[PDB]
Amino acid sequence: MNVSVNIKNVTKEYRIYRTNKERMKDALIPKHKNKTFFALDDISLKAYEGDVIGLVGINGSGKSTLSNIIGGSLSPTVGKVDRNGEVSVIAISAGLSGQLTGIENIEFKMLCMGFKRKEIKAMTPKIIEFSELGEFIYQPVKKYSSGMRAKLGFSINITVNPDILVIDEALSVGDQTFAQKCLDKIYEFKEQNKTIFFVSHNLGQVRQFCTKIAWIEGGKLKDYGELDDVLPKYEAFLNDFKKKSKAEQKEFRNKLDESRFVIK
Amino acid sequence: MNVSVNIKNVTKEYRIYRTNKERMKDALIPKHKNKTFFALDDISLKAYEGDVIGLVGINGSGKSTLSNIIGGSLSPTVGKVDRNGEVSVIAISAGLSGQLTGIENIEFKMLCMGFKRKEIKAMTPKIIEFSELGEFIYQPVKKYSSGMRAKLGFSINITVNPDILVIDEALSVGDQTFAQKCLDKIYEFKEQNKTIFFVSHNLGQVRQFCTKIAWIEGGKLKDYGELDDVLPKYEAFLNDFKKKSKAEQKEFRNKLDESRFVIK
Amino acid sequence: MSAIGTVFKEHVKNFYLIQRLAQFQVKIINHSNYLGVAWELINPVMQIMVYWMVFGLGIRSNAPIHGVPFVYWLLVGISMWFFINQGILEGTKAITQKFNQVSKMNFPLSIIPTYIVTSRFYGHLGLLLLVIIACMFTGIYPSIHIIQLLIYVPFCFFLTASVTLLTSTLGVLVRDTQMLMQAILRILFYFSPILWLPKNHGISGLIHEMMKYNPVYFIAESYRAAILYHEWYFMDHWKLMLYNFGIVAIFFAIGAYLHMKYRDQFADFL
Amino acid sequence: MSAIGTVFKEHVKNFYLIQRLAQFQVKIINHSNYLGVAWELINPVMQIMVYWMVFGLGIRSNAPIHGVPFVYWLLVGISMWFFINQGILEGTKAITQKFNQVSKMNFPLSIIPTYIVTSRFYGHLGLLLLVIIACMFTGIYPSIHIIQLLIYVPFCFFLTASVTLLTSTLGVLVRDTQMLMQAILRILFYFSPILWLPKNHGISGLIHEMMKYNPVYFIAESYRAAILYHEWYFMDHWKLMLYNFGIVAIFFAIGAYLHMKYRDQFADFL
Ligand SMILES: Cc1c(CC(=O)N2CCC[C@@H]2C(=O)O)c(=O)oc2c(C)c3occ(-c4ccc(Cl)cc4)c3cc12
Ligand SMILES: Cc1c(CC(=O)N2CCC[C@@H]2C(=O)O)c(=O)oc2c(C)c3occ(-c4ccc(Cl)cc4)c3cc12
Ligand SMILES: Nc1ncnc2c1ncn2[C@@H]1O[C@H](COP(=O)(O)OP(=O)(O)NP(=O)(O)O)[C@@H](O)[C@H]1O
Ligand SMILES: Nc1ncnc2c1ncn2[C@@H]1O[C@H](COP(=O)(O)OP(=O)(O)NP(=O)(O)O)[C@@H](O)[C@H]1O
Ligand SMILES: [Mg+2]
Ligand SMILES: [Mg+2]
């Protein structure tokens, strides 16, 4: 019951200017107030220890923004979030230079995180064995396929031990055997009491991966709860949206857009 | 029964040099023969009219190479392929400039394909309506999410009418409602007697999208046939691979790698 | 022989596409600047000022040349240099930088550097206009001898492209050429009548005879004759015209042949 | 006052990381070249040759200065220019170009331009060594007065970084500065003792008095005094030392304050 991540009233706004030249107007004299877009609004989150939490929602709901805020690459406009450990985030396109080869990419990544060269050379064989790259580890990364790049990035991130791990649709390109291996690794990490966040648009993978569900609709948390409770509501909402006619769908999207934008 | 695409003995090799400086050795005097990797080897394909063909295989099998060869961005080393129409390919990361906005990207793409400005302005509203982008069509593309970018690219490609359409895992980022809309569009295109190739690692989407299956294993076509015949064999192979121990999996991968590489 | 015809047909068929792509690239490279496309006129002008303060005020003690003030003598000759330098420098990296985005796309690969050059020609034209407008304040007014520009302004363009079509391919095969180009162009700048005029009849006589082989010499002198000197340049120097036409033809032939021979194997090299 | 301490602590803590990242960037920028990292020594040398052929052989008629041949007088003064120019030009675009790849990564953002500068300093050092080795063939051998380099070689570095830390932030807020920098540096090149020496006692006396405010003047003269002239430079020109130290401190303070004030809102601007 160790509180891993706590989020209290996190809110994020973005300033929208139709013209590129309007950026300087509000930067030199503070009297200007333009239109703003609420990417997030009053999100409260409590992630305990040994939990797999899956974020669900339609495109543009604000899952990547929340994942980046948890990771630390973004700063909330209002509110604070505290983490009891070190976090690492994997995305659909991780940091891998196309010109560099696999070994150069590995040493670059582990140098940015702050590992000595002897530690890098000691940890390299584990990455090599987990990636199943073979000869192609010596070839340039640009020669890799998408699944091979995903495997290399996932192995690099997994080999170092993070307290909190975030996966943001990274497994979509990987095949089924890689998914099973990642599932075994996730079970081991759960045994090690790490906290894992999983984002995917494949509902079967979410069902077989996650244990708690957070539903985000238009930047607001519609529902947080157990898998068996929240997931059926999301599926029923998807079927109901499929039932609706085109005009009703357009009206619903327009209502969400009206709610999200405000002039202040 | 119109033969849409015909492929007869398509074979592709890549030259592998461990050192970057060995490229010039075989380019100035033709006596050098280095190690080569068979990305494809003796592929024969016959795609008729009104067919949805799904490519299946593990990571690194050679599905993207075959899709690019069909599209025309690649040239086979040995063999020829003929197409009765114009083809268009959508990938996991289509051509969209991050600095440019949606409208500038649209006009760039339709200028590269050879459309006059009046035609571009006439065809823009259909793209706007299909993308469901709203105000964000005026914002820069870098502000978009992954699903929004996929929707914009898919709408741009769909609005123009191609004889052959290839989708290479582009729908993985899109949600379920977008998938249903694409399914309806695919039904309409089947009514229009277009030929669609679909590649995805989501087997339910493949089942509900495709009608014929081509299985690629190590650059060689293991089996081509109907969905109900080929798909169960692939699933059984996946379960059998899950059954096998780590040493057996490593031996199988090593055997495939031994088969693919040759010094000639 | 087939390569030349193929490249010529590709360029003739896609003229408007080349123009539109150049116009789009001009906007792309000037995206986040507050002034916008005005920098295309501001960036060269400042340089000219520096070249007038160093070589005009410092050296030469502001002495006129051929009865013309040095400021306009430098202004007429400096106009083409920015276009030539920028076109040659950016066209060598056109294929290497923008291969992946165009490998999937279906348009001829031989027109990729050309519109890059066309992204700069526009700016040059504008500067040229201003120079002529700036020449009326001294008392130099346009004459009939300005019609010669119709032969001279295009030729410079046909020179720059003819270089890039080669240096792009040579850039893909060997990456060191992009580093060598910056060394060559400087030699083409200082050994030119852009800033100084040789005196001959000595150790500079060999320099004067060697400078005639530089194609920048012909362009600068022809521009000055058309705009400043009121003289039919081709009556006295048709040998230079023929030599430069031959140079352009040789460059185009070699570039087209090399581009067509190695076009298929671009992905393996890059 | 807190910004200066924060930036100093960030730089002190990540010294070895800065060195390793600079070493990796050196390899990254010289990837596909066949010669490799040799171009870091080849690219400047060729330029020097050109600057000797134009300003040494053409102008000045190869006349010695201060009892020293002009070739070595130019060689000693030209060494730092390539490092300074490249560091200032590439450090202004360091944050803008490489923001997304480092926004996700967790290291201080104030050390991003610095190692960029450190990617060039290496090469400068090498060139400097060769210059000293090249000076022994005339008869100029190292003396005790060379120990002054221990004060002078670092200062130049501490100058360049002090500029970039400012110009990077000013580059994010306004994109036009990257276009203005190329105009400024040229003025800093020609109005310097790198290629010429003013005569004073006339219209060049004001030029001589104005040139002392250029920080390149102090660096070039100090290098020449340490290597060529056999003279303790700081005994006669300590006022210039103090003025340049003040300039460096002011640049560092302003850059640190501006970087810390706008660090949070980088994504909205870029
Ligand atoms: C005058 C000058 C020589 C001449 C020189 O120095 N020479 C050559 C033969 C011998 C004689 C000498 O030994 O003194 C030179 O070479 O570069 C220069 C550079 C690189 C210069 O940048 C700027 C000026 C300058 C600009 C404006 C004003 Cl108002 C005043 C100055 C400037 C002058 C010279
Ligand atoms: C000599 C020279 C003047 C002097 C000049 O032209 N001046 C200035 C005062 C009046 C006098 C004149 O009116 O003739 C100049 O300005 O630029 C030059 C540039 C830009 C030059 O690049 C290359 C040479 C050069 C190199 C090697 C050899 Cl072996 C021979 C030549 C070269 C000379 C001058
Ligand atoms: N820098 C930005 N400026 C303005 N709006 C932004 C910016 N970054 C993101 N947005 C918007 O914020 C919203 C949330 O985006 P995002 O969180 O990536 O969607 P998502 O939850 O990841 N859905 P998905 O497309 O499946 O990834 C979208 O409407 C974006 O257009
Ligand atoms: N330019 C290249 N040089 C050498 N090998 C290459 C090159 N391009 C691709 N390959 C290799 O060719 C094989 C086929 O790649 P690819 O076709 O992209 O895999 P795939 O079928 O798409 N599987 P997936 O990862 O799901 O996309 C892989 O082993 C690649 O490493
Ligand atoms: Mg996302
Ligand atoms: Mg692929």
Author numbering:
A (entry chain B), B (entry chain D): 1 to 264
C (entry chain C), D (entry chain A): 1 to 270
Q: Could you share sentences copied from the article?
A:
Wall teichoic acid (WTA) is a polyol phosphate polymer that covalently decorates peptidoglycan of gram-positive bacteria, including Staphylococcus aureus. TarGH is a heterotetramer composed of two TarG polytopic transmembrane domains (TMD) and two TarH nucleotide binding domains (NBD). Like other ABC transporters, TarGH uses the energy derived from the ATP hydrolysis cycle in the NBDs to drive substrate transport across the membrane via the TMDs.
An ATP analogue was required for measurement of direct binding using microscale thermophoresis with AMP-PNP leading to approximately an order of magnitude tighter binding of targocil-II compared to ATPγS. Based on this, we determined the cryo-EM structure of TarGH in complex with targocil-II and AMP-PNP at 2.9 Å resolution. Clearly resolved densities for two symmetrically disposed targocil-II molecules are observed at the extracellular interface of the TarG dimer. Notably, the negatively charged L-proline carboxylate on the opposite end of targocil-II interacts with the electropositive side chains of conserved Arg60 on TM1 and Lys199 on the EL-loop. In addition, more remote changes are observed in TarH compared to the ATPγS-bound state without inhibitor with notably the TarH D-loop now adopting the canonical near helical turn (D-loopON) that is conserved with other ABC transporters. This puts the active site in a catalytically competent conformation (D-loopON) with the backbone carbonyl of Val173 flipped and ideally positioned to coordinate and activate a water for nucleophilic attack together with Glu169.
